[PDB]
Amino acid sequence: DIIIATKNGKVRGMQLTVFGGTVTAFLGIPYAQPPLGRLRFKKPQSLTKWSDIWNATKYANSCCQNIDQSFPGFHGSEMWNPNTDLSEDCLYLNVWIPAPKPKNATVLIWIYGGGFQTGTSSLHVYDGKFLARVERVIVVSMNYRVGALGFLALPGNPEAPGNMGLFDQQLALQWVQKNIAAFGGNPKSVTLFGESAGAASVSLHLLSPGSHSLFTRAILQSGSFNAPWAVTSLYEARNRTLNLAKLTGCSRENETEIIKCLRNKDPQEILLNEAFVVPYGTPLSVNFGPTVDGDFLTDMPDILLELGQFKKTQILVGVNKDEGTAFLVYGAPGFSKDNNSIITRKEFQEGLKIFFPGVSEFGKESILFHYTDWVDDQRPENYREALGDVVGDYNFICPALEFTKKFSEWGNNAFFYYFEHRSSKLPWPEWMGVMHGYEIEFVFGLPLERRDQYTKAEEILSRSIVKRWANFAKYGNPQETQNNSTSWPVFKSTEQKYLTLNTESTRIMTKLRAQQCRFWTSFFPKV
Ligand SMILES: *[C@@H]1O[C@H](CO[C@@H]2O[C@@H](C)[C@@H](O)[C@@H](O)[C@@H]2O)[C@@H](O[C@@H]2O[C@H](CO)[C@@H](O)[C@H](O)[C@H]2NC(C)=O)[C@H](O)[C@H]1NC(C)=O
Ligand SMILES: *[C@@H]1O[C@H](CO[C@@H]2O[C@@H](C)[C@@H](O)[C@@H](O)[C@@H]2O)[C@@H](O[C@@H]2O[C@H](CO)[C@@H](O)[C@H](O)[C@H]2NC(C)=O)[C@H](O)[C@H]1NC(C)=O
Ligand SMILES: CN(C)CCN(C[C@@H]1CCCN(C2Cc3ccccc3C2)C1)C(=O)c1ccc2ccccc2c1
Ligand SMILES: CN(C)CCN(C[C@@H]1CCCN(C2Cc3ccccc3C2)C1)C(=O)c1ccc2ccccc2c1
Ligand SMILES: *[C@@H]1O[C@H](COC2O[C@@H](C)[C@@H](O)[C@@H](O)[C@@H]2O)[C@@H](O)[C@H](O)[C@H]1NC(C)=O
Ligand SMILES: *[C@@H]1O[C@H](CO)[C@@H](O)[C@H](O)[C@H]1NC(C)=O
Ligand SMILES: *[C@@H]1O[C@H](CO)[C@@H](O)[C@H](O)[C@H]1NC(C)=O
Ligand SMILES: *[C@@H]1O[C@H](CO)[C@@H](O)[C@H](O)[C@H]1NC(C)=O
Ligand SMILES: [Cl-]
Ligand SMILES: [Cl-]
Ligand SMILES: [Cl-]
C-alpha cells in the first residue's frame, strides 16, 4: 500500500510487476477542475484540495472525441481509438515511478498525438511502466481536451479564447513542478516528449512564455508547429467557430452568446458537426487546433522561430521513413490496405486533389512535375510510392527538418533521427512501410517484453532507443555509451548530420531529403 501526499491531497497508487521487478503506478490523478457547464471552452481552472485518499488505480476517462471507424475489427486503426469512457470530465494525468522509490529521478512527460482532434494517454503503446522499470525515470502523461472542446477559438474572448487543450497540458506541467518531488522526481530535470500533434504541442511549449520554467528539454517525434496542419490561422479559426454555430443553431450576433448557446449543446452534437466546419477536408484535416491567441502563443510561431524567441535548450527531433502512407488508405483513389495499391498516373493526380484541395491547378502540377520525373517508367509502384512521399515530405519530414535547422541556428545542440525499421507486428500491409506512429512502441519499450512476439533484433533496437531517449532526458546527449554504439552527432545548420535507427546498421548521414525539402520549404509556400 503506497500513499503519496500531494499539495491537493493524498493519492493511492498500485504496484505492478514488470520484468521480474516492480513499478508503482498512479493512474488517473486529477489536475484541474472538470471543465463542465460554464467551464466548457474556458482555460482549465486549478483544482482545490480534497480530504480523502484519492484512488489512482485505474486510467481515467478520455476526453470527448470522434472515433476512427473506417476499419472496424482491424487492429491497425483501432489500436489508436480511445480505450476508456469518453467524458468532458477528462483532465487527469498518470505517474509511473520505479521501485524502490527514486530519490531525484529525471521526469519524462508524454504528450499524445493525433491531429489535435483525438487521442488519450491510456493507450497501450503509451504505457510508461516499461520506461520506469528499465531506465529508473519517472514517466508522466496527461489527458488534454481535443477538437472543438479543446481548441474552439474566438481570439480575444475569454469565453472561448482558443488553445485550451494547450493550457490543459501546461497546467499538468505545473502539477509536476509542484508535486513530482513527493514521488521522488526532480522538477529541475523534466523532458517533454510527444508524437505528431503531441510533438507539435511540445514545440509550442518551447515558444510559450508560460511554459518556459516548466521543463528542461524536448523531444519531437514526427511533428512540429511549422507543419502545415499544426496551426490554425485567426481568420480560419473564426470562420470555423461561426460555421459550427450555424450547424448547431447557435448563430448569434453577440459572439459571447454564441458561446453560451454552444455551452448548452450536448457533447455529441458538437462532435458530429466538427467535421463540417470546413468546405473541403482531407485525411490531414485539423479542424480545431492551435491558434495565435495572444496568451499561450504571443505571435505567429514562424516569426518567433525565425527570430530566436524560444526556450534555449537541447532538442531531439526525428521522423519515420514512410510518414505519408498511413493517410493514403483513407481517401486516395486506388489505395487499399488489402491490396498492394498499384495506382496509375491518373489516380496519382486525383490523389493530389484529395490531399491539396484548396491548391491551384499550377500548384498541383508542380508537385506532379517534381515527384514523377523518375529513373525508369518501368517500376509499377512508382506512383504509389510518389504519393506517399508527397504526403510524408510536405506534412512531416520537411517541417521537422526546417524546425531543427532554425532552432539550431541560435546555438543549441540538436539531434535528428531517421527511423526506418518496420515492426514485425505491424498490422498494416508491407507496402505502407515504416508508418507514421510506429516508432512509438519502440520508444516506450514494448519490444523488451519477450512474451510479445517481437524479434530479438527488435528487442535490441528498442533497448538502445530507450537508453538514448533517457540519456537525452538525463544529460542532454542521446548516446548509448556502453555497447560500442554509433555516436550520435549534433545536427548543425551546415552539415545537417542525422542518425538512422534500424535493426540492420546504425549510420550517420547528411542532408535528409535535401532536394524534396527545397521544393516544399522554398517554393511551395508561394503557391
Ligand atoms: C467559411 O464558411 C463558408 C460556408 O461553409 C459553409 O457553411 C458551413 C456551416 C459548413 O456547412 C460548410 O461545409 C459550408 O461550406 C465557406 O463557403 C462555401 O465555399 C464553397 C467553396 O469555397 C462554395 O462551393 C460554397 O457555396 C460556399 N458556401 C457558402 C455558404 O458560402 C467558406 O469557404 C469558408 N471560408 C473559408 C476561408 O474556408
Ligand atoms: C485495391 O483496392 C481498391 C479499393 O477497392 C476496394 O478494396 C478491394 C480489396 C476490393 O474489396 C474492392 O471490392 C473494393 O472496391 C481498388 O480501387 C477500386 O477499384 C474499383 C474497380 O472495380 C473501383 O470501382 C473502386 O471505386 C475503387 N475504389 C477506390 C477506393 O479507389 C483498387 O483497384 C485495388 N487495386 C488492385 C486490386 O490492384
Ligand atoms: C499515431 N496516430 C495516433 C495514429 C492515428 N492518426 C493517423 C490517422 C491518419 C488517417 C486517418 N486518421 C483517422 C483519425 C480519425 C478519427 C476519427 C474519425 C476519422 C479519423 C481518421 C488518423 C492520427 O491520430 C492523426 C489524425 C489526424 C492528423 C491530422 C494531421 C496530422 C496528423 C494526424 C494524425
Ligand atoms: C493571416 N494574417 C497574417 C493574420 C494576421 N494576424 C491577425 C492580426 C490581428 C488583427 C489585426 N492585425 C492587423 C493586420 C493589418 C494590416 C493592415 C491593416 C490592418 C491590419 C490588422 C492582424 C495574426 O497573425 C494574429 C492573430 C492573432 C493574434 C493575437 C495576438 C497577437 C498577435 C496576433 C496575430
Ligand atoms: C535534486 O537535484 C537538484 C539539482 O538537479 C539537476 O539540476 C538541473 C539544473 C539540471 O541540470 C538537471 O538535469 C540536474 O539533474 C537539486 O537542486 C535538488 O536539491 C535535488 N533534490 C534532492 C536530491 O532531493
Ligand atoms: C480506494 O481503494 C481501496 C482499495 O484497497 C478501498 O479500500 C477504498 O474504499 C477505495 N476508495 C474509494 C473507492 O473511494
Ligand atoms: C454580449 O452579451 C454578454 C452577456 O450578457 C454581455 O456581457 C456583453 O456585454 C454583450 N456584448 C454586446 C456587444 O452585446
Ligand atoms: C548492453 O549490452 C549488454 C550485453 O553485454 C546488454 O545486456 C544490455 O542490455 C545492453 N544495454 C543497452 C543500453 O543496450
Ligand atoms: Cl452556462
Ligand atoms: Cl497529364
Ligand atoms: Cl554532404
Residue list, annotated binding site for substrate: 114-115
Q: How was this structure determined?
A: X-ray
Residue with cell 490496405: 337
- The residue whose C-alpha atom lies closest to atom 1 belonging to ligand 8 is 483
For ligand 1, whether the C-beta of 239 sits within 6 Å is yes
Distances, alpha carbon 284 to alpha carbons 115, 196, 271, 466, 516, in Å: 7, 11, 17, 29, 20
Structural contact between residues 507 and 486, judged by C-beta atoms closer than 8 angstroms: yes
Resolution (angstroms) stands at 2.1
Residue 6 in 3-state DSSP? strand
Three-state SS for 226-251 is CCCCCCECHHHHHHHHHHHHHHCCCC
Between vectors from CA 201 to CA 196 and to CA 203, what angle results, nearest 5°? 100
CA of 250 to the centre of ligand 9 (A): 14
CB 297 within 8 A of CB 210: no
Query: Would you call 323 a catalytic residue per the annotation?
Result: yes
| 9, 189, 356, 370, 383 from 374: Cα distances, Å | 64, 48, 22, 9, 10
Task: Answer yes or no: 141 catalytic.
Answer: no
Which of 137, 483, 486 is the pocket-test mutation for ligand 8 (most atoms within 8 Å of CB)? 483
Q: Which residues line ligand 3 (CB under 6 A)?
A: 66-68, 80, 113-115, 118, 196, 229, 283-284, 286, 326-327, 330, 436-437
Which candidate, 139, 137, 165, 168, places its Cα nearest to that of 152?
165
In which residue are the cell numbers 530535470 written?
Answer: 189
Residue 345 Cα to ligand 10 midpoint, Å, equals 8
Asked if residue 465 lies in contact with residue 501, where contact means CB atoms within 8 angstroms, the answer is: yes
Please identify which of the residues 189, 436, 439, 441 carries the catalytic annotation. 436
Distance, CA 263 to ligand 9 centroid (Å)? 6
The hierarchical CATH code for the domain 1-527 is 3.40.50.1820
Smallest CA separation from ligand 5 atom 13, residue: 189
**Ligand 4 within 6 A of 303 CB?**
no
Q: Phi-psi bin for 69: left (phi > 0), alpha (psi -120 to 50), beta?
A: alpha
Cα dihedral 143, 147, 151, 154 sign: negative
